[PDB]
C-alpha cells in the first residue's frame, strides 16, 4: 500500500481495522490527494469494485482450487497434530519400503527424521 503524502509501504493484513472510516480520516485522505495532485476513484469503477467483491464473496470454489488452497496452507502449516500423525505414518510406510528394499542408507535418515519429529508428551 502507499499513503499519498508518504511513500510506499508493505504491510501485513492484520494491521487493518474492522472499524469504518471516519469523516476526518477521509477528509485528510482527500487533502493528501489534492496535495499530491491525484483524483478520487470514479463511481463506475466503484461499482465495478463492488460487483467484483460480491462475485468473489459469492463464488463457489472448485475442487482444484480447494486443493491448491489446502496445499498452500499446509506449506504455511507450522504444526498440527492430525497432520503430524499422518506424516509419521507416511514416514513409517517409507521406512518399511526402504527396509524391504535392503537400503541401509535411506533407513538411517528416515529413523533420524522420525526421532526428531517424535518424542511426544
Amino acid at each position: 500500500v502507499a499513503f499519498p503524502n508518504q511513500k510506499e509501504m508493505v504491510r501485513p493484513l492484520f494491521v487493518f481495522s474492522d472499524s469504518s472510516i471516519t469523516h476526518p480520516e477521509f477528509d485528510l485522505f482527500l487533502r493528501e490527494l489534492d496535495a499530491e495532485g491525484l483524483s478520487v476513484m470514479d463511481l463506475r469503477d466503484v461499482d465495478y469494485k463492488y460487483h467484483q467483491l460480491k462475485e468473489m464473496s459469492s463464488r463457489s470454489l472448485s475442487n482444484d482450487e480447494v486443493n491448491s488452497i489446502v496445499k498452500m496452507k499446509q506449506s504455511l502449516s507450522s504444526n498440527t497434530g492430525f497432520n503430524t500423525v499422518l506424516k509419521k505414518a507416511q514416514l513409517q510406510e517409507e521406512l518399511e519400503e526402504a527396509r524391504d528394499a535392503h537400503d541401509h542408507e535411506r533407513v538411517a535418515r528416515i529413523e533420524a527424521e522420525l526421532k526428531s519429529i517424535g518424542a511426544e508428551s
Binding site: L13, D18, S20, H23, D42, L43, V46, K49, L53, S57
Partner: peptide, 20 residues
C-alpha cells in the same frame, strides 16, 4: 466520472475477518 461519496466507499468495506 462522478466523485465517490462516503457511502460508496462504505459499500466496499472489506474487514480483517473478511480478509482472513
Amino acid at each position: 466520472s462522478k466523485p465517490a461519496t462516503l457511502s460508496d466507499i462504505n459499500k466496499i468495506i472489506f474487514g480483517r475477518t473478511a480478509m482472513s
